[PDB]
RNA sequence: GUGAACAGCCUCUAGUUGAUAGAAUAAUGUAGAUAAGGGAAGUCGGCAAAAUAGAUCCGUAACUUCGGGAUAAGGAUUGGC
RNA sequence: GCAGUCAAGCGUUCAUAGCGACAUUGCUUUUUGAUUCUUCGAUGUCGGCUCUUCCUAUCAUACCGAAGCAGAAUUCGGUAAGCGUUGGAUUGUUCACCCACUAAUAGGGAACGUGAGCUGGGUUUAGACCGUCGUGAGACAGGUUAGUUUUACCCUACUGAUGAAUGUUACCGCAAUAGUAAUUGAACUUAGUACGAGAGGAACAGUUCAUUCGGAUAAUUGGUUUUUGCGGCUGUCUGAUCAGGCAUUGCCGCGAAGCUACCAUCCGCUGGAUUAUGGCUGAACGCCUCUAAGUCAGAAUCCAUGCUAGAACGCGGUGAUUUC
């Protein structure tokens, strides 16, 4: 999350810590986006870094174009999984872990995004809510 | 050495020692402060957690992502019966502290209260308050002096209220006795007030209002003997280590030769006295109203117990109080409320909530139906039935 | 505050109660527990299982008066 | 804006594939049919207009 | 009897019912287990655990001393009547 | 290893903003050396894991003073140890070095903290391969692979738990002393404002969230299943039926109640006195001066407020107080 995010991200339970593998989502040549990383995320030894909907994760991609091979990037958490929870009392998961990789300031590299996208991450990135079509 | 990778102890020191606490009543250590101008009145209340259950509401957060929108939290429930005043006390100031100077308690004595002032009642003469019943009989003259002694001297001034546990689905009988300070004008205005209700009758909407700050102080339930694990929030041991991993590796270090007080052991979990701040009132029910679930919304005719009771606990008759989030201490359990020692001006607090909708459906599973009513509306009849 | 109904069972979601689920073609489908929604994860079809709204209208059990006549006609002439 | 059509049931809204005939199209061509957004035939807060008609003149 | 079987599991014959007890069910254990989302980030190291598994059928790489590799791999099916 | 003094120099100019030669005076005991006082009727060394405490020569956080401080950024210093100081790749390693987050990823002590606490990967017995040396047995501060980590019931310490005697017994209380807790970040707004030629570019109030930490609670969601509670399944055994038995809880789906989770929800208070530092009045010293007398403002500090115990040899108020 963080820098060239406009509003605030509400506390949802984070699903997916470093190694997780996720879904690309977008169109990029990219398929998969293994994360690193979590920006914002804080120190307790021992605990590992995780990232829900809508967190912003440095990554790098183990298939796809082999020019988005062997390198690090920014990217964006746009789906669950982990059952996370929202103050209007629901409990919701989707059915896989995706992203989207951006730069750092939340923009993207793709065309547009495959697959429904979490609100809670759409109000977040003003250009997840471009490329985005069912939300939520 | 020195560590390795600093990292935050566990637990916390203000908590010591934990052991089980000395009463089921935790105790009020402290009192609002006093503005002797406003009305005299309670500064407190006896209770019965009944449980919790869900409430939802909309929200006034100027500001928030969820301003102007509905949201669902939970409440517990006090269940709070109006207490009865039996008793007055006045305190003093001594260079060595307070100290109690009189009480002066009332005529006629419920076996509520007179249960408590016993262990083997059944086999018992109950002889308890009849010499003292009497100092009425001629005239009043001693317990007029007494009042008249609080009065001359006494600092500060509590009331001996008691719950009425009989109107409580609780088994119990043997009623709770408690202090109360008394936070209203001139401690002279004060012993009046105190005098004037023995024998008589407090009720909760006196204290206490909808959408106000109060604190809850009770004793934590019970878990007994604690791995140090559990106890004190203590990482497990890795799988390969001989003699168990639920411990702490090092106990200690080497000098200063002992165990010390600040590292983790084994011991009892839980019991322990909790006075707990910042709690806000939902909703302020009365026992003499049909519908207390019902809202402005909602309207649906129903108290709110939940369906098949509250589990664990009863039925809730009379009148509760009931408060944002969850309360130290478990069901059926004495619990105190109390005025806060502070005016907040949280925003968070003078928020002035309005309840759309109580959840009336069963805690006995995964329940589905809030009125009896909306069962057989939905479902059909059934073998048994008309 | 809508109550909602089960995809699966077909019973009221009263708020907060039961769980959500966001499908990979951007369908949904709330179940008001756990029970449905094992269930519904197991591929189990709701018109063979006995206790459901779904099974229950197919098999036509105890509607009765919902076909019973109503009345509800005027007369007109202007 | 969407509207009603009698009998979907449903206090949604759901796509379907409409024809000549039916309400909520009037087709284009010679055996045209288009899929179209439609409200249910039960009411909910989500209307912004309800379309109602008398029977009985009350008092 | 099930089954490929002297396997496992249940039974007939025969033989046992021997191994201090009683009441509880704290921590810590030993032995038996499950756990959301993630999936070796743990650790000297996948240690431990888990996953696989029978049979019928389809399918089967490098390399080779042509005997192999090979149940390679990868797949489908399996009750009852 | 850390810190001074003199001030030739550097620093456009300019000794001391920041530095600093040649000399010189010191502190430290996480370097290493020097010694050989104590431990050879013995009981492992390395590292890690875990957990506590302490130190300050302070990385970050609070308040300051200085700048070759226009803003932003950054450096030097003062009060400061209240608080935090992480996640990974290769290595047995400490060390090292990269990847990455972070507010910051400071350095040290505690028998070079911590083996009846663990692990045993390295080292350092016996087996074995290679290189070098040796006629040889064998050797190597060379590379390799394999190689048993015992005892607590005692005392004390620590956590929790009873408890005789100060008439009995019961209820309600006070508070000595002890402990004490919260943390850090971003976004909006301020505001493209101050400043600046431009590039760039803040902050105090207000609001919305969030990290680390803590104490509860189970309405909801999830986990758990001997509720062997309901249904299903194989094998066998009761002639079949009905209903059941055995398979170290036979297996499977559901599964209430409890227990439980940043995997779940809730709550985490406000006063005073100070430090540094900037000031007022003001002499000493007819002037000047925050200082000498006196005095104002002030910090993640301190004492309280609050919170946890409640001295089983500190205590107040109150009830009832036995007859064969
Ligand atoms: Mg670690
Ligand atoms: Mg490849
Ligand atoms: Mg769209
Ligand atoms: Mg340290
Ligand atoms: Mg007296
Ligand atoms: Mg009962
Ligand atoms: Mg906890
Ligand atoms: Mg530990
Ligand atoms: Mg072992
Ligand atoms: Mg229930
Ligand atoms: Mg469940
Ligand atoms: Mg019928
Ligand atoms: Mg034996
Ligand atoms: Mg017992
Ligand atoms: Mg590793
Ligand atoms: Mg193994
Ligand atoms: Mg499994
Ligand atoms: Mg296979
Ligand atoms: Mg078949
Ligand atoms: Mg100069
Ligand atoms: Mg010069
Ligand atoms: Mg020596
Ligand atoms: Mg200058
Ligand atoms: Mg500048
Ligand atoms: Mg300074
Ligand atoms: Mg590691
Ligand atoms: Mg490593
Ligand atoms: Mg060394
Ligand atoms: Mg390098
Ligand atoms: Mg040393
Ligand atoms: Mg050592
Ligand atoms: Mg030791
Ligand atoms: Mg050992
Ligand atoms: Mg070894
Ligand atoms: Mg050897
Ligand atoms: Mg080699
Ligand atoms: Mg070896
Ligand atoms: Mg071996
Ligand atoms: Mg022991
Ligand atoms: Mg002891
Ligand atoms: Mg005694
Ligand atoms: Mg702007
Ligand atoms: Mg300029
Ligand atoms: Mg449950
Ligand atoms: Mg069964
Ligand atoms: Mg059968
Ligand atoms: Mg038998
Ligand atoms: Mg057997
Ligand atoms: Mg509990
Ligand atoms: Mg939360
Ligand atoms: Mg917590
Ligand atoms: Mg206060
Ligand atoms: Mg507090
Ligand atoms: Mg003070
Ligand atoms: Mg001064
Ligand atoms: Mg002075
Ligand atoms: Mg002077
Ligand atoms: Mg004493
Ligand atoms: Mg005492
Ligand atoms: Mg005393
Ligand atoms: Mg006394």
Same mark, same amino acid.
């Given at each position: ?57 440095? %990554? ?77 | ?46 209770? =019965? ?27 517990? @429930? @006090? ?38 002032? !016993? ?12 010499? !003292? ?71 909760? +909407? ?57 590292? %983790? ?5 839980? !019991? ?9 009132? !939902? ?29 664990? =606990? ?73 | ?78 | ?36 957004? @439609? ?6 807060? +989500? ?13």
């Amino acid at each position: 999350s963080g820098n060239g995010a406009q509003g605030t991200k509400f506390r949802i339970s984070l699903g997916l810590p470093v190694g997780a593998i996720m879904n690309c989502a977008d169109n990029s040549g990219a398929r998969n986006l293994y994360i690193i990383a979590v920006k914002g995320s804080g120190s307790r030894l021992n605990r590992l870094p995780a990232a829900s909907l809508g967190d912003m994760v440095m %990554a790098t991609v183990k298939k796809g174009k082999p020019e988005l091979r062997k390198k690090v990037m920014p990217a964006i958490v746009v789906r669950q999984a982990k059952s996370w929870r929202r103050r209007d009392g629901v409990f919701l998961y989707f059915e896989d872990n995706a992203g989207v990789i951006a730069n750092p300031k939340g923009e993207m590299k793709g065309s547009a995004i495959t697959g429904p996208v979490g609100k809670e991450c759409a109000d977040l990135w003003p250009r997840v809510a471009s490329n985005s079509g069912v939300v939520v | 050495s020195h560590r390795k990778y600093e990292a935050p102890r566990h637990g916390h020191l203000g908590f010591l020692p934990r052991k089980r606490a000395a009463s089921i009543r935790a105790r009020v250590k402290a009192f609002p402060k006093d503005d002797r101008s406003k009305p005299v009145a309670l500064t407190s209340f006896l209770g =019965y957690k009944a449980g919790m259950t869900t409430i939802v509401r909309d929200l006034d957060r100027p500001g928030s992502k969820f301003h102007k929108r509905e949201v669902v939290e939970a409440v517990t @429930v @006090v269940d709070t019966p109006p207490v009865v005043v039996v008793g007055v006390v006045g305190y003093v100031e001594t260079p060595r502290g307070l100290r109690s100077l009189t009480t002066v308690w009332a005529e006629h004595l419920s076996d509520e209260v007179k249960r408590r002032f !016993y262990k083997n009642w059944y086999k018992s003469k109950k002889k308890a308050f009849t010499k !003292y019943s009497a100092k009425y009989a001629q005239d009043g003259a001693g317990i007029e002096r007494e009042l008249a002694r609080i009065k001359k001297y006494a600092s500060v001034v509590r009331v001996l209220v008691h719950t009425q546990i009989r109107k409580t689905p609780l088994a119990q009988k043997k009623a709770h006795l408690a202090e109360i300070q008394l936070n209203g004008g001139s401690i002279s205005e004060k012993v009046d007030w105190a005098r004037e209700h023995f024998e008589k009758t407090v009720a909760v +909407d006196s204290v206490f209002e909808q959408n106000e700050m109060i604190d809850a102080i009770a004793v934590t339930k019970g878990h007994g003997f604690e791995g140090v694990t559990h106890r004190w929030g203590t990482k497990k041991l890795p799988r390969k280590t001989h003699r168990g991993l639920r411990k702490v590796a090092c106990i200690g270090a080497c000098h200063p030769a002992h165990v010390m007080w600040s590292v %983790a052991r084994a011991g009892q979990r839980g !019991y322990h006295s909790r006075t707990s701040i910042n709690h806000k009132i !939902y909703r302020v029910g009365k026992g003499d109203d049909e519908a207390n679930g019902a809202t402005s919304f909602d309207r649906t005719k129903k108290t709110i117990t939940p369906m098949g009771g509250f589990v664990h =606990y009863g039925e809730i008759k009379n009148d509760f109080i009931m408060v944002k989030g969850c309360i130290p201490g478990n069901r059926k359990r004495i619990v105190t409320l109390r005025k806060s020692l502070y005016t907040n001006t949280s925003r968070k607090a003078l928020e002035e909530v309005s309840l759309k909708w109580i959840d009336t459906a069963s805690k006995f599973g995964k329940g589905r139906f809030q009125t009896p009513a909306e069962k057989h509306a939905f479902m059909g009849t059934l073998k048994k039935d008309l | 505050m809508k109550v909602e109904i089960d995809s699966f069972s077909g019973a009221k979601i009263y708020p907060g109660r039961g769980t959500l689920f966001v499908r990979g073609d951007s369908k949904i489908f709330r179940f008001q527990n756990s029970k449905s929604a094992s269930l519904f994860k197991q591929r189990k079809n709701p018109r063979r299982i006995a206790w459901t709204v779904l099974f229950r209208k197919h098999h036509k059990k105890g509607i009765t008066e919902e076909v019973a006549k109503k009345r509800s006609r005027k007369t007109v002439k202007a | 804006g969407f509207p009603m059509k009698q009998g979907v049931l449903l206090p949604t809204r759901i796509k379907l594939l409409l024809t000549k005939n039916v309400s909520c199209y009037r087709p284009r061509r010679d055996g045209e049919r288009k899929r179209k957004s @439609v409200r249910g035939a039960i009411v909910g807060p +989500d209307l912004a207009v309800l379309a109602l008609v008398i029977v009985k003149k009350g008092e």
